[PDB]
A paper describes a structure:
Maternal embryonic leucine zipper kinase (MELK) is a serine/threonine kinase in the adenosine monophosphate-activated protein kinase (AMPK)-related kinase family, and was first identified as a maternal gene in mouse eggs and preimplantation embryos. Out of all of these potential roles, MELK is best characterized as a mitotic kinase, as its expression pattern highly correlates with other mitotic genes. At the protein level, MELK is hyperphosphorylated, and reaches its maximal abundance and kinase activity during M phase in both Xenopus embryos and human cancer cell lines. Due to the potential oncogenic role of MELK, several groups have developed MELK inhibitors to validate its potential as a drug target.
Here, we report the discovery of HTH-01-091, a potent and selective MELK inhibitor. HTH-01-091 inhibits MELK with an IC50 value of 10.5 nM, which is comparable to MELK-T1 and NVS-MELK8a in the same enzymatic assay. To better understand the mode of inhibitor binding, we determined crystal structures of MELK in complex with HTH-01-091 and MRT199665. The 2.5 Å structure of MELK in complex with HTH-01-091 revealed a type I binding mode. The quinoline nitrogen in the tricylic core forms the only hinge interaction with the backbone NH of Cys89. In the deep pocket, the 3,5-dichloro-4-hydroxyphenyl group engages with the catalytic (Lys40) lysine and recruits Glu57 on the αC helix. Toward the solvent, the cyclic urea group forms a hydrogen bond with Ile17 in the P-loop. In addition, the cyclohexyl group of HTH-01-091 is sandwiched between Val25 and Leu139 in a nearly orthogonal orientation with respect to the core, while projecting the (dimethylamino)methyl tail into the negatively-charged catalytic pocket made-up by Glu93, Asp150, and Glu136. Many of the corresponding interactions were previously observed in the MELK-OTSSP167 co-crystal structure. However, in the OTSSP167 structure, the cyclohexyl group occupies the active site in a manner that makes greater van der Waals interactions with the P-loop, causing the N-lobe to be in a slightly more closed conformation reflected by the proximity of Phe22 to the carboxyl end of the αC helix.
Residue numbers in the entry: 0 to 154, 170 to 333
The structure:
Amino acid sequence: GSKDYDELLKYYELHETIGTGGFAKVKLACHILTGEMVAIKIMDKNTLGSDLPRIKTEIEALKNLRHQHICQLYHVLETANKIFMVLEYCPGGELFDYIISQDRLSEEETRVVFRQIVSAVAYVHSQGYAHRDLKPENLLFDEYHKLKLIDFGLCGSLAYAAPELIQGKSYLGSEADVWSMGILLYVLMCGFLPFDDDNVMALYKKIMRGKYDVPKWLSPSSILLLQQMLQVDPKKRISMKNLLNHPWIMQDYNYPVEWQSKNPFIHLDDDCVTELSVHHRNNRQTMEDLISLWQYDHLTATYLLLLAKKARGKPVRLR
Ligand SMILES: CN(C)C[C@H]1CC[C@H](N2C(=O)NCc3cnc4ccc(-c5cc(Cl)c(O)c(Cl)c5)cc4c32)CC1
């Protein structure tokens, strides 16, 4: 109802719907106080049904994941019938779009993108999580052409799922993510899937078999990294630690993947704390302690959006 939007519309101006993926809608919106554009995931609690616990799973995970290549959660607002998630806006489109418009990426272009994927996923695993749904549709570009991983509903698409997922057997989520990243690496450099079939049963068999075509344009180093990631035996898959400084990964770079987060939880920006304090009528030390609770209310949304507004070189001012 209109009651479900009262608190929301005190903080954001709604623009057009930019996507109806899954069972939720995502709208473009503008944070009134800072002017920064955000994405708002709208969910109807009476409609989510049994997919509703997975929404709590994604929120709890997003509250615990803060990293330059993970879509940032700014604000969680729950009403009587709606759950609102205010997220980092990614106008650059999906990695799916980038691949399909450049029928395939070169090895150099692939390394630029893949190193960001390895960065996000390695950080996810360092926090005790596994994504379990890695796919080009879940990686978006911002306005700086930097990748952002989205959709933590599981902590999946069949062509990216590891064979042990297909059989329904037990599995470690981290090893399942490495397989999907191997499928990602193949798609990035070939433009098509390594295992594909119009019939699901035939795709089941092709995945579990593990054999795939190796196009002629793949470098020898690309091939061996692929077979190091696309191992049917999950215990023979390359680990994440070995991926961070893998020879292929480091070609043209000569430094391992910077997987650790730079967006902190501890340190606060004094310019942002100052601008916030002179806008809520309370002393600065109280404003500093309130921000540090990280409730993902309007306060933390305003802080991190003002933080991002500052990084863009815009004046660190409110409204
Ligand atoms: C079908 N799913 C699996 C893949 C689709 C999902 C919608 C995407 N999307 C658009 O519809 N237009 C552009 C666009 C721009 N900024 C976005 C910012 C955040 C999110 C976001 C973040 C999280 Cl954490 C999350 O859970 C969800 Cl659902 C969305 C989506 C955005 C977006 C496109 C890929």
